[PDB]
Amino acid sequence: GKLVQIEYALAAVAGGAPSVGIKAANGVVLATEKKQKSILYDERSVHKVEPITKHIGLVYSGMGPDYRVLVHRARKLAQQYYLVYQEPIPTAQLVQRVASVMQEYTQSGGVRPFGVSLLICGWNEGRPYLFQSDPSGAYFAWKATAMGKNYVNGKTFLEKRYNEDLELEDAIHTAILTLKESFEGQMTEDNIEVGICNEAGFRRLTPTEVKDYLAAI
Amino acid sequence: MFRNQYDNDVTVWSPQGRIHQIEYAMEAVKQGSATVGLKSKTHAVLVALKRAQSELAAHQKKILHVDNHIGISIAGLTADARLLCNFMRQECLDSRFVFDRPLPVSRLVSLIGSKTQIPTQRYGRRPYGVGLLIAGYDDMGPHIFQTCPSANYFDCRAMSIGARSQSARTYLERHMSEFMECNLNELVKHGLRALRETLPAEQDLTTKNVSIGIVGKDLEFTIYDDDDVSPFLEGLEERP
Amino acid sequence: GFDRHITIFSPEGRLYQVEYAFKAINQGGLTSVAVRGKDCAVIVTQKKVPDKLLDSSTVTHLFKITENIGCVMTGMTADSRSQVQRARYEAANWKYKYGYEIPVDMLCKRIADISQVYTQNAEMRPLGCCMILIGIDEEQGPQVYKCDPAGYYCGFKATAAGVKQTESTSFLEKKVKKKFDWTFEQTVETAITCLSTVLSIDFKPSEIEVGVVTVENPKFRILTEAEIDAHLVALAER
Amino acid sequence: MFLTRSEYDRGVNTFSPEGRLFQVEYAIEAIKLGSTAIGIQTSEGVCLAVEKRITSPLMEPSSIEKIVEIDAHIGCAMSGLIADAKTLIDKARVETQNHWFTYNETMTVESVTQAVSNLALQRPFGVALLFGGVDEKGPQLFHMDPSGTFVQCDARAIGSASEGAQSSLQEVYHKSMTLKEAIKSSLIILKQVMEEKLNATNIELATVQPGQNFHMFTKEELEEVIKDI
Amino acid sequence: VENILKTLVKSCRPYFPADATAEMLEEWRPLMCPFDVTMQKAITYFEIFLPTSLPPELHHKGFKLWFDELIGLWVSVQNLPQWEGQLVNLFARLATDNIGYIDWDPYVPKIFTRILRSLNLPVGSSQVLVPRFLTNAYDIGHAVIWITAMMGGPSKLVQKHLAGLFNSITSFYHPSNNGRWLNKLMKLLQRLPNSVVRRLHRERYKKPSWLTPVPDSHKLTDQDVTDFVQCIIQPVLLAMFSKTGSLEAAQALQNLALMRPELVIPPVLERTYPALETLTEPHQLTATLSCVIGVARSLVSGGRWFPEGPTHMLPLLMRALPGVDPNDFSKCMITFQFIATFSTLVPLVDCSSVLQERNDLTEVERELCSATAEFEDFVLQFMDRCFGLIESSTLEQTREETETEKMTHLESLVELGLSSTFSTILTQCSKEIFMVALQKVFNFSTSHIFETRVAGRMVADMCRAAVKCCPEESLKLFVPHCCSVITQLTMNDDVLNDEELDKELLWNLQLLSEITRVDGRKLLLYREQLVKILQRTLHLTCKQGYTLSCNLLHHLLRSTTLIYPTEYCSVPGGFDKPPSEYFPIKDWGKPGDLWNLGIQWHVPSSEEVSFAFYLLDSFLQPELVKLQHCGDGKLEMSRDDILQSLTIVHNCILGSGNLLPPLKGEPVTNLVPSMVSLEETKLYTGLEYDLSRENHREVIATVIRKLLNHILDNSEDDTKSLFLIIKIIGDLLQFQGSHKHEFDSRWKSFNLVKKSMENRLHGKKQHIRALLIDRVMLQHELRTLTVEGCEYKKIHQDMIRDLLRLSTSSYSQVRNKAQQTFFAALGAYNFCCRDIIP
Amino acid sequence: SSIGTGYDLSASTFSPDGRVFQVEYAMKAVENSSTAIGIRCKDGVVFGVEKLVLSKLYEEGSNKRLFNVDRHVGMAVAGLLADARSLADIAREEASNFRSNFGYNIPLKHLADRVAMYVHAYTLYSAVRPFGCSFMLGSYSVNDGAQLYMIDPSGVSYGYWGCAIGKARQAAKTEIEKLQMKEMTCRDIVKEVAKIIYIVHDEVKDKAFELELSWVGELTNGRHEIVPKDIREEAEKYAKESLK
C-alpha cells in the first residue's frame, strides 16, 4: 500500500529535529533546534530556516534534502504568482501548491514520498498565518504546533501556555521555552535557529537578538 | 529443485560471469534444421535442409535474398530472422542508393552485431534467438559469415548450424583444403554430402527438402528450390 | 525485502540504501582530510598504488572543478569521476548564466540536489561518492564544504571522509577545541598529522597527494612531491 | 493428468535452457481451441469450409461470419473468436488496397499473408488464419499459424481437431482433385469432427476460382450441396 | 469457555463408569436423525463424551456397542456433512487407544481415498474447480493419528495404501507445482513421522501404566518402519526445496532419522554438499542447512546403523564458515544455528593422542580423531567472519540533524545469534582453544574502537561470552585495560561537565559494562578498581555515559546477588582435565544424565552480598538523600540532575531486587469479609533475607512519593524524570529480583530449542545438558516470579494512588506508561480493585 | 557460499557490505577470457593478445580482439566480444565528434574518460546490465607520449606503463614487471610481448591460439597498425624458442 510509505515518512519526520511555531497577535515565530554533531560543523553555513518570499518563511522537521527541494519549488511558485498578479503570494495559496507537489510525488510510483513536514508562516492582509504541510499532502492551520522529537509533548506544553492574545516577544519566549524542554542542554545562539513573520516581513533573527531573547529567560 | 536465481533475465550477470539467457538463446538455434555454408576461391554456397510440418505443407523458406550479392540461411526463430532480414535489406538498399555500390559483407555483419547486441544489455527485450549463415561475394572475395544470438560473428571457410551440425562440421574440416580449389559443382556436391552427414539414415536428401543458394563473381545470388537443385543432387554418390 | 533493495522508507523511516552507500564509501578504502585556516584551506589524502606498472601520475583523487575550486573524492572511483564531471558542468553553466564564478557552497548545494534525485528515485542507485570542496570566497575567505550521498551538505572548519573518518574527526575536534588559528604551514602540518596519526603510516611524500587554496593565491594548486617533502621534513624535525 | 510444470515456463521473454519459448508455445496451444475449419487447394480452385456454432435461433446467421473477404480474389478463414482476428483482417484489407493504389495490380496471397505476419510480430495474437485465393500463379492456400509463420499447403485444417482432420485430409487429397470433389470431401471431414448432422445453419462454405471472384455459398447453394452427399 | 468444557470432559472421560457408555448411547441415539441438525448434536456429544479408553475385559461394555453403527453411518454417507469430521476424530481416538483390538482392515481403502479427497488436489485435463459447497473438515492431524494407529499388524495393506498414496501425490510435492494444496500436504508430511515415532515410543520405551499395552503382535516391526520411511522419504526430499521453506520437511527428517538414520542422512548430505559449494542455487543452502539442523543429533549419534556418523560434521562446518556474511540475513541466521547446533552436540578438542593410541579406536573413530585437529582453524575462521560481520554492522548515522539511538529488529537478531553461537563454541572449546580465541577477541576490541550503538554492542557481547566461558583469565586480560584506559582518559575531570564524552571512553565503558556480567566470585578480585571507576563515571553529565555506568552498576549487582548456573557445558566438568585420560570422541552426542547433571550454581557468598550492600550504600543513598533534599525546600536542582539520580536509583533497584526485602505495611482493614483465611505464599528461593539492615526499598518508597508530589506541584514539564519515576514505582511495587519479560523470552526460547533438538523416540527425557540446566534455571525464575495474593498494605495503596494520579496527568506519554504500571499493580494484589474504583 | 536475497540481481542496488555485485560478476566474466597484454615503450605502445582458435573451420583474423577506434588509437579487448564491439563503436563515435567539434585528434585521457562514463552509466541504472568487456586503449602523439589506459567494467580508468587483463593477467603482470619497458623500443618490446603471451598460455587448458599483435608509435607516424608479417613471424619464432 502507498499509504504505508506515507506512514513511514511521518515516522521519519517524527525522527527529525524539533521545530516550533507560535502565532502571536501581531507576528508569527518559527524556531527549531539546529544542534551540531560536532564543533567542526559550522553553524553559520546552513540555515534550517529559509524564506520563500519577503513576507513568508518556513522551517522543517525531517529530511533536509527534501526540504531543499521543496523550498526551491516553493520559491519558484511564489515568483510565478508574482509575475502573473504583481502582488505577493498568499500563505494559504503557497501552502496549497506545496501540498500539491508533495501529493504529486507520493502519488507518483517509482519514487518515495518526501520525508519532511513543513511549518509555513507568513503575514498578509495585516494578519498572521501559520500552516503545517505533511508528507501526505495534507495541510492544516494552527495557532501553534511543534514537530520532530517529542512533538506531542511540545504540543501539550503549548496548549497549556498559549494565550489568544500575545505579543511577538512573548511568543518568541514561549517558543524558546518549548524548545528548551526538548533540547538536550547548553542551548545557545548557534544551536537554535529563529525566524519571525510580521508587518516588516520575514526575517531570520540574528545571533545577537537571539542571545538577547535567551538571556531574558 | 535447482532453480537458478540469475537466469531470470538477460540483464542479470551470474556469479560465474555468464549470461544464462544468452547461452540459452544460443542453445535455441540448434533447434532448427541443419544448414551448410561453404566457399571456393570464387564461389560461395548455402545448402539447407528445409522441413515441413506435414507432407501437404510445402516447405519452410530457409534461404533468403538480402541482396543480389548476399544471401542468408536462417536457423532459430523465424520472427527474429525476418526482422534481421528487413534490417539488412534496408541497409543494403541504403548503401546502393547513397554510394551506388554493393554493401560489404563485413560491414553488414557488423551492423547486425550492433543490432543484436542491443537487446542483450536492455531489460525486457529478449535476444534474437536466431543463427544465420551469411554468404556473399564482394571485391575481396567470397565470404561465409556465421552469427549467433550472442551477437558474436565469425568468418569461415565453411560452417554448419542447426541440429546435428557437428557431423557436417567434421566432414567440412576434413575436406576444407579440397573446397578452396574446387569448381562450383564440386563445391555444391561437398556441401550436399556434408548436409547428408547430419541426416539420419532413414532420411535421404531429396529435391523437395534441399535448397541451394549460390553466389559468384559473375553470378548473382540465386536460390534453387526443388527442380533447380535436381541436377546438383543427381551427381552425388550414394551415402555409405 | 523490497525496502533494502530500493530507496524507500523503512518502518522506522530509514533509507537503508543510503546507509549502504555510506558503507561503500569506506569500501573504497581511502582516507581524506580537510582543514580550514584564517588565510587558506588544504586537502590531504593518500594515493598508495598497488601496482608498480600503474602510473602514479594518472591516479589521483584530487580534481579541479574550476581554477579557483579544488575537490577530493572518496569511494567508488567511477562515481567519483562522474560527480566531478557534473560539478565541472554546473560550474561552467553557472558562469555562463550569471557572469561570475560559482561559490563553493552553491556548488555543493547543486551536487547535493543531484544526489538527492538518486536517493529519491528508485531506478537510480545513490551515487557512492563523497566530495569535499575548497575555495576562497571573497566575503567569507576560505571555505570547506562536504556533500554526502544522502544530500546533506554542511560547512566545516575541518573534516574527514574515509574509512578512518571517525578517528580523524576525533583528532580534529581535539585540535580545534583549542582555538589554534592556523597559518598555511600550520594547516598543512595539522592535516598531515591527522592522517599520519589515524593511519599510523608515517607517509613518504609520494604516498600522499596535497592540494590547497590561499587568499594570496586563490588558484587551486596541487603541491608537487618536493614541496610536500619539504613540509613533511619540516614536520619530522619538530 | 497431474500438474506438470517447470520453473522456466510462464516467462514471456525468457529462453528455456533447451532454447524453447514455452510461454508462447503454450499460448499457441490455447489458440488452437477454435472452431474447426478446412481448406483445400486444387487446380480448379480453393474450397474453404467452417462450422458456425450459433447458440440460438434468434441470432442472425449472417451476423457471425467465420469466413471473410480480404479482396475479390482472396478469401480468409479464422478459428477462434472473430474479435482477435478483426485487427489482422483490417490490416490485410488495407494492405491489399495499398498495393492496388500504388501498383494497379492485385496483391498475391503470399504477399498478403506475409504482410499480416509482418503485423503479427511488429505477441502470440491468438488467431490462426487460412488464406485462400486465386492469383496469377494459380489457386493457392496459405496457412498462417498463430506463431506468425506462414506456409503454402495443398490442404490444411485448423481448429479444435485440425490434426484429426489433417490425417483424413492426407488420405483423401490428390492433385487431380476437382473443386467439386474437394467440396464433397471437405464436408465429409466436417461431418466427422463435428459429429452432428450437417445443415446450412451449422456451416459456412466459400470458394475462389480463376473464373469468378470470392463467392460465399448462399443458403440454397449449401442445401443443394449437402443433399448431394 | 467451550474449549475448556471439552478439555474437562475429555480429562474426566476415562474415569466414567463402565455402565456409563450404554446410557450415554440411549440418551443421544434418538438424536441421530441424519437429516436433522440433532445428528450434529449427537455426533459432537459422542466424540466429546464416549470413553475410547477402557481395559480389554470391558471393551464389550465400551466401544463394541457403538463402533459398528457409527462406522456404518460414516461409510454409508458419501456427501460431506459437518458431523463427519467429528466422527472421524472419534474414530481416530478410538483407534489410537485400541491399537490391535480393532481389525480396521475392511475400511482402509475408503479411509485413505476419503483423506485424498480431503487434500482436494487438482487432476484431469479439464482441471475443473470443485464446487466448494462441501468442506471435508478432515483435520490432517487427526487423519494422521488414525493412520498411524491402524498401522502395523499382521495385514500389511495399511502400509501398502500409505505408500500408494505418497507415490500418487509425489508430483504435487514438487516445488515447481506449488499451490494451495501444498500447505495441507506439508501439514501431513510434518504430522505423520511424529505419529509413527510417538507410536514407537509407546510401544518400546514407555513405562508400564494402567493403559492397555500395545499388543505384541500389532507392535511395529523393523520392516514396517523401514517400509514407512521408504514410502515417505522422496516426498520429504522434494519438499526440502519447496518454495515455502521446508520447516515441515526439517521436522519430518528429524523424526525419520531417529528411527532410520542410515536411510535418511546420506541423501540429504548428498544434496547439502553441492549446495554449500554452488553459487547459482542459493535456496538449496538454507533448505539443506535447516534440514541438517533437523537431523544433527541422529547424525552425530552414530550407533553403527549409520557408521559414517559424525565424519561429515567438520567438513560441513568448515563449508558453513563462508555462509555467514553481511549480505544474507537468512543465510547468516541459519548458519549461526548450524554452527551452534552441531557445536553443542559435539565436544570439540583436537584429539591428537587418540590416533596415536594403538588400539580401541574404530576406523571412523580414527578419522574423527584426525578431523578434530581442524577445530582450532574452524573457530578462528568463524571469529574472523564474525568480526567481518561487525565491520559490516556499523550504524553510520547519515542524518546531520540527529543520531538514530535505536536498534532495529533484524540487527538485534543477528547480535543474539552471534553471541549465543560464540558462547556455545567457547564453552564447548578446550583450554588452549579458549586462550587463542581470548587473545583474538581482546586484540579486536582493544585495537579497534567501535561505535556503541550496534557494533560495539556486538563486540562487547562477544567478549562477555568469552569471559563467561573462562572468567578468571579472561577478566585478568580485559579488566585492567579498560580500567586503566578509562581512568587515564577521564583524568582531566572536565569530561564530567562535557556532554560530548568523546567516543573511546563511551566504548570502553560499554565494554566494561558488558564484561562485568559474570560469576561474582571471580569478579570480587577486581573490587577497588571497578568501584573507583564507577565513582568517577556515574556523574558524567551526558545522557550516554551515566547511563552506561548505571548499566554497569546494574549488571554488577545482578551478578553478585542473583543465583544462576555458571557452567552450561554439554558434559559436566568437560575439558577441565589437562590429561588425555578424558576421551572426547566418546562424549559426542550422549544426551540425558539428569541425575548426574551436577549443576554448578553460583550462590551469593557472604562477601558477595556484603560487597553489594556496601556498594549500594555508597552509591544509591547519596543520590537518595539528594532527592529528599530536592523534595523538601532545599537543594534546588536541575531536571538533568534529577534525571541522573533517578536513573541511578532505578538501576540500583533492578540490580538489588533479590537482597532488599519486599515492602511492608499495615493491611487495609476493610478489604472484604472472608470466613476462610487469606494468606500470601512465602517461597524461600535461596533468598535468606537479612532484616537487620534498614530497608532500602522502604526509604526509596517514601522519598519517591515525596518527589512525585514535588514535581507534580512545581515542574510538570520534566517528562523524562517522570518516566523514570514510573519505572521506579513499578519496580518497587512488584519487582522481586526477576523480570517477567525476561522470563517469557527465556521460556519461548527453551520451548523452541527443546522442540528442535527433541529426541522423542527413546530415553524418555533424553535431552542435552544445556537445555536441562536451562529448564532448572527457568524453574527457579518461575518460583521467584510467582507470588500469591498479598496484603493490600497501605504503602502499596499509596503507590497505586500516585500511579493513578499520573495516569491522570497532562502528558499522554506518562499517562500511558503509568497506565501500564498501574494496570500491573492492580493485577498484583487481591481485592486491590475494590479500593481504586471510587 | 551463495546469497539469495536479491541484492546482487540489479546493478542499481547496494549490498549491505557496500559492494555492487553485478559489476564484480562482470569483472569475473572478464577474468574468464583469453589474456590480452599492452606494453608501452618510449617510442610507442604495443598490444598483444591470444586469439584462441575455437575451431580450425574459422578462417583467420576473425573474432578480432584488436580494434582501431581511431586513426591514431587502437583498442585491445577482453571479455565478451559483442560488448567490446559496442564499446569500440562508442569510442569511434566519440572520436568522430571530438574531431568534428575541436578540429584535432582526440587526446587519450579524454576518450578513455568518456568511454568510462558510458560504462559507468550502464552500472547505476536498473534496466541495463554492466558491460562485460574490459579493454586497453593506446595511442602515440608527438605532443603527448605513448599512452596506455585500461578500462574495467566498473568504469574506472587508469594509465598503465604495462597492463594485462584476462585469466592470467597476474602471471603476465609479474613477467612484465620482470622487464624494462620505459627505455626499450617498440620493436624489441614486440619480441618480449610474444614471449609473455606464449608463456602464460596453457596448451592443455586452451587447445590452440593465433597470436595477434598491434602497435602504434613514432615508427608508424602515430597510426595504429597490424604488425608486418615478417616481424610477427620473427617474434612468434623467438617466443617459442624462448619457450623451449
Closest CA to C42 of C212, C218, C198: C212
Q: DSSP readout, E411-448?
A: HHHHHHHHHHHHHHHHHHS-HHHHHHHHHHHHHHHHHS
Distances (CA, A) of E555 to E480, E689, E740, E785: 18, 20, 17, 19
- Sequence-ordered list of residues with C-beta below 8 angstroms from that of E765, at least 6 positions apart, any chain: E592, E594
> What is the helix (H) or strand (E) element at residue C42, kind and residue range?
strand C40-46
Which residue shows C-alpha cell 614487471? Answer: F177
- Answer whether E330 sits within 8 Å of F16, measured CB to CB: no
Q: DSSP readout, E488-546?
A: HHTTTSSTTT-SS--HHHHHHHHHHHHHH-S-HHHHTTS-HHHHHHHHHHTT--STTTH
- Sequence-ordered list of residues with C-beta below 8 angstroms from that of F211, at least 6 positions apart, any chain: F48, F49, F50, F51, F194, F197, F198, F232, F236
Q: Which of A63, A156, A185 sits opposite E499 (nearest CB)?
A: A185
DSSP state of A111: B
Closest CA to E511 of E496, E489, E539: E489
For chains F and D, tell me whether 3 or more CB atom pairs sit within 8 A of each other.
Answer: no
Q: Beta strand pairing status for D74-79 and D128-134?
A: antiparallel
CA distance E468 to E475: 9
Closest CA to E458 of E405, E545, E386: E386
DSSP state of E346: S
- Sequence-ordered list of residues with C-beta below 8 angstroms from that of C120, at least 6 positions apart, any chain: A66, A69, A105, A111, A112, C7
Distances (CA, A) of E348 to E559, E585, E724: 29, 8, 47
DSSP state of E134: S
- Answer whether C12 sits within 8 Å of E400, measured CB to CB: no
DSSP state of B177: H
Neighbours of D103 (CB within 10 A): 9
CA distance A193 to A187: 11
Greatest Cα pair distance in chain B: 59
Distances (CA, A) of E593 to B96, C98, E345, E346, E570: 94, 86, 14, 16, 11
Give me the number of domains chain D comprises.
Answer: 1
CA distance D44 to A136: 75
Q: Which of E398, E449, E503 sits opposite C19 (nearest CB)?
A: E398
Cell of B224: 534453387
> What is the helix (H) or strand (E) element at residue C35, kind and residue range?
strand C31-36
- Sequence-ordered list of residues with C-beta below 8 angstroms from that of C186, at least 6 positions apart, any chain: C37, C180
Neighbours of F243 (CB within 10 A): 12
Sign of the torsion formed by the C-alpha atoms of C155, C159, C163 and C168:
negative
Q: What resolution, expressed in A, was reported for this entry?
A: 3.2
Sign of the torsion formed by the C-alpha atoms of E244, E245, E246 and E247:
negative
Cell of E516: 562485568
Q: Beta strand pairing status for A139-141 and A128-133?
A: antiparallel
CA distance E762 to E589: 14
CA distance C132 to B13: 34
In the beta sheet, which residues pair with residue C32? C45, C161
For chains E and F, tell me whether 3 or more CB atom pairs sit within 8 A of each other.
Answer: yes
In the beta sheet, which residues pair with residue C72? C62, C132
Neighbours of E153 (CB within 10 A): 22
Given strand A28-33, what is the order of strands in its sheet?
A: A144-147, A19-23, A28-33, A192-197, A203-204
Helix (H, G, I), strand (E, B) or coil at E197: helix
Cell of E803: 500511579
Q: Measure CA of the first residue to CA of the last residue in chain B; give whole Å.
A: 45
Cell of D118: 509482418
Closest CA to B135 of B192, B60, B199, B216: B216
Residue F6 touches partner E, C-beta closer than 8 Å: no
SS (H, E, C) C148-171: CCCCCEEEECEEEEECCHHHHHHH
The total number of residues written for chain D in this structure: 229
In the beta sheet, which residues pair with residue E26? none
Residue E813 touches partner A, C-beta closer than 8 Å: yes
CA distance E206 to B161: 71
Helix (H, G, I), strand (E, B) or coil at E790: coil
CA distance A40 to B212: 81
Which residue shows C-alpha cell 580465541? Answer: E437
Q: Beta strand pairing status for A28-33 and B63-65?
A: unpaired
CA E833 to chain centre: 34
In the beta sheet, which residues pair with residue A133? A118, A139
CB-based contacts of D169-177 (< 8 A; 24+ apart in sequence):
D169/B56, D169/D38, D169/D40, D170/B54, D170/B55, D170/B56, D173/B56, D173/D40, D175/D42, D175/D43, D177/D40, D177/D42
Please say whether the beta carbons of A88 and A53 come within 8 A.
yes
Rg (CA), chain A: 17
Cell of E485: 584506559
- Phi/psi at F72 (5° precision): -95, -5
Domain limits, chain C: 1-238
Cell of A164: 489568544
Closest CA to F199 of F70, F35, F63: F35
CA distance E815 to E803: 9
Exposed (0-12), middle (13-18) or buried (19+): which is E467, by Cβ within 10 Å? buried
Mutate to test the interface with B, among E279, E280, E288 (most CBs of B within 10 A): E280
CA distance E549 to E555: 10
Cell of C56: 602514479
Please say whether the beta carbons of E260 and E226 come within 8 A.
yes
SS (H, E, C) E376-412: HHHHHHHHHHHHHHHHCCCCCCCCCCCCCCCCCHHHH
CA distance E414 to E430: 25
CA E305 to chain centre: 32
Helix (H, G, I), strand (E, B) or coil at E692: coil
- Answer whether C55 sits within 8 Å of F120, measured CB to CB: no
Distances (CA, A) of E260 to E230, E298, E305, E380, F154: 10, 9, 8, 35, 53
Phi/psi class of residue A82: alpha, beta or left (left: φ > 0; alpha: ψ in -120 to 50)?
alpha
Cell of D169: 485430409
Which residue shows C-alpha cell 532413414? Answer: B202
Q: Measure CA of the first residue to CA of the last residue in chain A; give whole Å.
A: 48
Rg (CA), chain B: 18
Residue C156 touches partner A, C-beta closer than 8 Å: yes
Report angle CA E675, E676, E681 to the nearest 5 degrees.
145
Q: Which E-chain residues 102-141 have CB contacts (< 8 A) with chain D?
A: 122-125, 127
Residue A217 touches partner E, C-beta closer than 8 Å: no
Helix (H, G, I), strand (E, B) or coil at E630: helix
Closest CA to E339 of E433, E417, E282: E417
CA distance D145 to D29: 11
Please say whether the beta carbons of B179 and B192 come within 8 A.
no
Please say whether the beta carbons of A74 and A97 come within 8 A.
yes
Residue E717 touches partner A, C-beta closer than 8 Å: yes
CA distance E118 to E110: 12
Helix (H, G, I), strand (E, B) or coil at B101: coil
CA distance B135 to B149: 18
Domain span holding position D222: 22-228
Residues of B with CB under 8 A from a CB of E: 1-6, 14-16
CB-based contacts of E366-375 (< 8 A; 24+ apart in sequence):
E367/E311, E368/E310, E368/E311, E368/E585, E368/E588, E369/E585, E371/E311, E371/E313, E371/E314, E372/E314, E372/E348, E372/E584, E372/E585, E374/E314, E374/E318, E375/E314, E375/E348, E375/E349, E375/E350, E375/E429, E375/E433
Residue at F188: amino acid letter: D
Q: Which E-chain residues 155-174 have CB contacts (< 8 A) with chain B?
A: 174
CA distance A122 to A128: 6
Q: Which F-chain residues 7-46 have CB contacts (< 8 A) with chain E?
A: 7-8, 15-18
Q: Kindly provide the b/e burial profile for residues E700-725, where b requires at least 16 CB atoms within 10 angstroms of the residue's own CB.
A: bbebbbebbebbbeeebbbbbbbbbb
Neighbours of C12 (CB within 10 A): 13
CA B92 to chain centre: 18
CA distance C28 to C74: 7
Report angle CA B206, D162, D60 to the nearest 5 degrees.
140
Please say whether the beta carbons of E356 and E366 come within 8 A.
no
Q: Which of E402, E640, E719 sits opposite A153 (nearest CB)?
A: E719
- Sequence-ordered list of residues with C-beta below 8 angstroms from that of C163, at least 6 positions apart, any chain: C26, C28, C29, C30, C31
> What is the helix (H) or strand (E) element at residue E770, kind and residue range?
helix E769-785
In the beta sheet, which residues pair with residue B215? B44
Please say whether the beta carbons of B126 and D13 come within 8 A.
yes
Q: Kindly provide the b/e burial profile for residues E598-609, where b requires at least 16 CB atoms within 10 angstroms of the residue's own CB.
A: eeeebebeeebb
Residue at F195: amino acid letter: K
Cell of E281: 542455487
Please say whether the beta carbons of A54 and A123 come within 8 A.
no
Query: Which CATH number covers residue D80?
Result: 3.60.20.10
Please say whether the beta carbons of C191 and C72 come within 8 A.
no
